[PDB]
Design a protein around this ligand. Structure first.
Ligand SMILES: CC1=C(/C=C/C(C)=C/C=C/C(C)=C/C=C/C=C(C)/C=C/C=C(C)/C=C/C2=C(C)C(=O)[C@@H](O)CC2(C)C)C(C)(C)C[C@H](O)C1=O
Ligand SMILES: CC1=C(/C=C/C(C)=C/C=C/C(C)=C/C=C/C=C(C)/C=C/C=C(C)/C=C/C2=C(C)C(=O)[C@@H](O)CC2(C)C)C(C)(C)C[C@H](O)C1=O
Ligand SMILES: CCCCCCCCCCCC
Lengths: 174, 180
């Protein structure tokens, strides 16, 4: 009952998609270093993951893991893949409980940062989530610098984001 | 995972303001019980037949109690509320428990014979999805009214062929539902 609490005013931003998206180069471990707080994500710190590339599927078998805001270590197991309707940088997220949602790769260098936007417009409101993925678990690293730029130039205020803590406590098993 | 009802297209432009002004003053004339005459495919209707929607107004918003038989075969009672939109839009939002609310425009109603309901949402990338309904005041609806609705939905371009008479009748355990 009601309107989910994360819906806010305004439609989703209309961000750009990375030009020639190479799933295969995008694979690997990516750490979440700044995210727009997202309710469907239980883990809130040490958030890290592995995007395994399949090629008969032409999609990723992503596993994400980290800690609770309380202190359990959770492990999520979804699928993420490009689709027939749009360019590969606009993929779809197929996780168990969560809504099919989009995964738009605004811009990436593959070797260093990836800026992901994900938001479904509802009428004149939106449920908007975003990520700043880096290949280093450095929360002040070059990813944030780079990506906060991209997001602003695309219409997603970087202020909307909070940092994911990566400290002594971290355990990257994913 | 993208639902099957999320489809290419825009919602239609209905004149909600007009409706909202005709409708707001007579909101008690809507309480009562409404039988579902027919609805366009809608996964949120867990009640397959004998759909008896009983609205109870309290001044501001209504409190629904819905009954009939599930698809499974059993007797089902579903609770809801139809209150005015909370972001100030000119339409009410309908919201059954164990669900997120949706908008619901009363397209045309005469308060005592039929009511045509329409509820649609636009999304990004060009998608949308609508759910329409027809409410009758009495289990069987005079096919003189069913035509005033069909006429109304044709104005907002809803493919009429999409509705499906639900099953209301003598069969129906109304009397049992009235106890829940
Ligand atoms: C991923 C993705 C997209 C994803 C879009 C999604 C995932 C949409 C999901 C939408 C949902 C889930 C809508 C539900 C939308 C649901 C809606 C509109 C529900 C309306 C319900 C009504 C009117 C109910 C009326 C009732 C009445 C009247 C009664 O009487 C009772 O007895 C019975 C009862 C059913 C309670 C994209 C399209 C943006 C495209 C992007 O490229 C992309 O990458
Ligand atoms: C009544 C009403 C309205 C009601 C609108 C509603 C009810 C909207 C509901 C929207 C939803 C429910 C959107 C969900 C939208 C949900 C979305 C977009 C979710 C995106 C999720 C992402 C990106 C997840 C990524 C993950 C990654 C990356 C990992 O790594 C893993 O660890 C974790 C994991 C979660 C799997 C109205 C506003 C239209 C206004 C009308 O006038 C009105 O009258
Ligand atoms: C299956 C949950 C039903 C939610 C009904 C209200 C509208 C939901 C819009 C969800 C958009 C992702």
């Amino acid at each position: 009952d009601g309107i989910p609490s994360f819906v806010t005013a305004g439609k989703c931003a209309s961000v750009a998609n990375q030009d020639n998206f190479d799933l295969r180069r995008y694979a690997g471990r990516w750490y979440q270093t700044h995210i727009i707080e997202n309710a469907y994500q239980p883990v809130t710190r040490c958030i890290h993951s592995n995007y395994e590339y399949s090629t008969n599927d032409y999609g990723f078998k992503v596993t994400t893991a980290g800690f609770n805001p309380n202190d359990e270590y959770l492990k999520i197991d979804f699928k993420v893949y490009p689709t027939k309707e749009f360019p590969a940088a606009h993929m779809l997220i197929d996780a168990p409980s969560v809504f099919a949602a989009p995964y738009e790769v605004i811009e990436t260098d593959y070797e260093t940062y990836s800026c992901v936007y994900s938001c479904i417009t509802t009428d004149n409101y939106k449920s908007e989530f975003a990520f700043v993925f880096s290949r280093t678990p450095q929360t002040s690293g070059p990813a944030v610098e780079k990506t906060a730029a991209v997001f602003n130039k695309n219409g997603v205020e970087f202020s909307k984001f909070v940092p994911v803590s990566h400290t002594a406590e971290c355990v990257y098993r994913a | 995972k993208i639902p099957n009802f999320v489809v290419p297209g825009k919602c239609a432009s209905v004149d909600r303001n007009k409706l909202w002004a005709e409708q707001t003053p007579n909101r008690n004339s809507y309480a009562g019980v409404w039988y579902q005459f027919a609805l366009t495919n809608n996964p949120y209707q867990l009640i397959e037949k004998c759909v008896r929607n009983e609205y109870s107004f309290d001044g501001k918003q209504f409190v629904i109690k819905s009954t009939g038989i599930a698809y499974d075969g059993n007797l089902l009672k579903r609770n809801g509320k139809l209150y005015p939109n909370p972001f100030g839009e000119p339409h009410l939002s309908i919201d059954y428990e164990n669900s997120f609310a949706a908008p619901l425009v009363i397209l045309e109603t005469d308060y005592s014979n039929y009511a045509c309901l329409y509820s649609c949402i636009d999304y990004n990338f060009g998608y949308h999805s609508d759910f329409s309904f027809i409410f009758s005041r009495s289990a069987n609806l005079a096919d003189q009214y069913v035509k005033k609705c069909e006429a109304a939905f044709k104005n907002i371009n809803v493919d009429t062929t999409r509705f499906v008479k639900t099953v209301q009748g003598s069969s129906c355990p109304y009397d049992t539902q009235k106890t829940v």
